[PDB]
Amino acid sequence: MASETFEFQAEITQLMSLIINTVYSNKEIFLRELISNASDALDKIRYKSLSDPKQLETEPDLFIRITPKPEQKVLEIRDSGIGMTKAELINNLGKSGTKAFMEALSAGADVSMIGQFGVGFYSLFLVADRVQVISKSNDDEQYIWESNAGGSFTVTLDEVNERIGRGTILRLFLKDDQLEYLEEKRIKEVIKRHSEFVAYPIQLVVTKEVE
Amino acid sequence: MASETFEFQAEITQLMSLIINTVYSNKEIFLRELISNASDALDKIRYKSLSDPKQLETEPDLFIRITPKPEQKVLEIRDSGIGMTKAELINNLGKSGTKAFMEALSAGADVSMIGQFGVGFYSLFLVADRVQVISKSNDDEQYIWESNAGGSFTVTLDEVNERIGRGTILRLFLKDDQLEYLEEKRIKEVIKRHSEFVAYPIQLVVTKEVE
């Protein structure tokens, strides 16, 4: 099952290198950005369902779900939002609040403004050196978008991951010095601090040994 | 991706109908049987690794993991044991401690003896009317074995489930009147009662809303 490869627009590669290498000390804000994007995608599928309730049937429950996978150094953020088709994955993450945000950064803006420029997605490279976006839109098959902060990304039909009824999984491959965010206490703390007003249940998946 | 279909040996179909329809009141013993089978598979991969440690590299951690999926009425029991190939799935579950166990039942034996006759796997039909066995052996690709208590089962190359490094997932589709076993308290209780001496960590995956 072959993967297709695509090149990032110049201003994206720049931003991503301008973030994976940063020594900025408030790295935890990535989670607010991802939760926000999730909330948005949920809003869209819900708004859409107003004039077509059948859209919900692929996944009746509207939720945000966070799943640490410590043994893999992975953190997953899932939502049952509207999702993205193959074309949307290729196009959407391929533009500029970018150049303008980079300019604000140069002038001393705090990285946390990133979401204001509509490019908060890339805040994930604060804690991760690699990401897979797994997405299922009602209008397409499930696909995997993958990037390692480099200049190119891949898109591949998904034949290896669990079936999403509908929506998106952000699978973050955390940096060796950020395993921090695999911990339940740490995670809940970050959520309480920046995501107080979310209209959708935020679920935490925790694995505990029975003793 | 086509599924292959196979017919059960006569004495298996019988046993399975002789269990899905039973009014036996101590249904919880299914979990002990499945945990035991898991422990066995872990023993085997560990014993095997004695003369070939590389066998462990597909999944270094040896564990039993229980994951309720309430919204799907599903309970999953996973282990990182030795797993089963396509041929093993077709053959292994296709024989008789069977006929002998059925005879013991007719005479008044308790269903809990089932494991003594080497057919404890089928105790799952006490709480489930459908099961998928998802398995990954180091020697084959990942496959799905599926049965609905009928006379035939299917085997299909797995292109829809999460990747198992190595081992087996029993995915139980619980009966409407047995959702019971999706609850953390209920589950831990059953484990403590019948699986005190398990050499491997038994993990429980619990999903909780952040509030």
Ligand SMILES: O=C1NCC/C=C/CCC[C@@H](C(=O)NCc2ccccc2)C(=O)Cc2c(Cl)c(O)cc(O)c21
């Ligand atoms: O699935 C998602 N969005 C719903 C469809 C609407 C998209 C509108 C524009 C925002 C969207 C986006 O930036 N997509 C481009 C993109 C494509 C591939 C990878 C990353 C980003 C977008 O936010 C994609 C997205 C992200 Cl980044 C997320 O963390 C969670 C999500 O549910 C989604």
Ligand SMILES: O=C1NCC/C=C/CCC[C@@H](C(=O)NCc2ccccc2)C(=O)Cc2c(Cl)c(O)cc(O)c21
């Ligand atoms: O993967 C498993 N076993 C390791 C390989 C050794 C098998 C030895 C014989 C027991 C085995 C078995 O009954 N297999 C036949 C079978 C084939 C297909 C579906 C169900 C059962 C067997 O117990 C398969 C098995 C079950 Cl049922 C389970 O609940 C958990 C498991 O890890 C395994």
